[PDB]
Amino acid sequence: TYKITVRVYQTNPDAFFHPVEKTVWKYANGGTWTITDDQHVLTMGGSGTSGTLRFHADNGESFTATFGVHNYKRWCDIVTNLAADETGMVINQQYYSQKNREEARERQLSNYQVKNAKGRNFQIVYTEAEGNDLHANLIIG
Amino acid sequence: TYKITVRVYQTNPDAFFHPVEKTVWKYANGGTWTITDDQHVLTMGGSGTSGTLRFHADNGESFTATFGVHNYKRWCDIVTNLAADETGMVINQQYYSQKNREEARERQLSNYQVKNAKGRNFQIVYTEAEGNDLHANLIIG
């Protein structure tokens, strides 16, 4: 089993985001998104799968944060330029079908940040980046 | 906009189910799963899409409950006995690709029930079953 526990930090009062979708890809016997003490916990049956959280703000901004394990190491990716028909479940599957997304996954990043077109920053940093009990902060700018 | 507000009733203390995935299909400008007073609220951009809740019990039982609107009428379906690689995102997309699931959506049911292999009943009943502000009970036996 691999677990990734995510703590969400919102740093900027000009917006407020909230989770609107939580998906789990089908490889490695799947897994679950659960909540313990205000943290989102992705539990997966083995290496090679992942799960996507999609966040939406009142003002229309949105992004996906995807977390998983590839070849026994954590990975993550943030997508901020979501097409009109790119829900979380669409994005999560693309990591196993679209080359650019497959490459983002296979980089096994333990830290990544990117901005949206409005200039807001989003960051995922794993503070426990090793082993089977992984911990990451999702930090919204 | 269509909204489906879901209340989960668990009637049988021999198991405890809890939500482990919530997905939104990409048609009709997608939508969101939010929570208001322990109710799961699926808000959709218009008719023609849907969203899936997956529930797991710590005893191994699991099922998906999918809610949506097809040609302006609500629909619903429950799938039980899920395989390890049938996560909620896999099931949700099946309503637009797999024949028996497409037919289930086309039925535009205001209520549906089914049992799993163990004999446990699962039912969806829309208590507000018309118009744009729909309400359903998901009742686990």
Author numbering:
A (entry chain B), B (entry chain A): 1 to 141
From the paper:
Sclerotium rolfsii lectin (SRL) is a cell wall-associated developmental–stage specific lectin secreted from the soil–born pathogenic fungus. SRL displays a clear specificity for TF and its substituted glycan structures. In the current study we report two recombinant variants SSR1 and SSR2, generated by the deliberate changes of the amino acids incorporated at particular sites of SRL by the synthetic gene construct method based on the complete amino acid sequence of SRL. Interestingly, SSR1 and SSR2 the two different variants of SRL, differ in their glycan specificity.
Apart from the carbohydrate binding site residues other deliberate replacement of the amino acid is incorporated between SRL and SSR1 at 14th, 113th and 123rd positions, where the amino acids Asn, Glu and Glu residues were replaced by Asp, Gln and Gln, respectively. The crystal structures of SSR1 and SSR2 lectins in their free form were determined at 1.7 Å and 1.6 Å resolution, respectively. Like SRL there are two protein molecules (named mol A and mol B) in the crystallographic asymmetric unit of both variants related by a non-crystallographic two-fold symmetry. The mutations of SSR1 (N14D, E113Q, E123Q) and SSR2 (T1V, N14D, T34S, E113Q, E123Q) were all identified and all atoms of the mutated residues were well defined within the electron density map. Overall the crystal structures of SSR1 and SSR2 are similar to the SRL structure and the introduction of the mutations did not seem to affect the overall structure of the protein. Only, the mutation N14D seems to cause a minor disturbance in the loop region of residues 12–14 in both variants (rms displacement of all atoms 0.18 Å and 0.26 Å from the SRL structure, respectively). The most profound conformational difference is on SSR1 and especially on the side chain of Asn81 which moves away by 5 Å from its position in the SRL structure towards the secondary carbohydrate binding site. The adoption of this conformation of Asn81 in SSR1 is made possible by a shift of the entire loop encompassing residues 81–86 by 3.0 Å on average, from their positions in the SRL structure. The glycan array analysis of the variants demonstrated that SSR1 recognizes TF antigen and its derivatives with high affinity like SRL but showed the highest affinity towards the sialylated Tn antigen, unlike SRL.
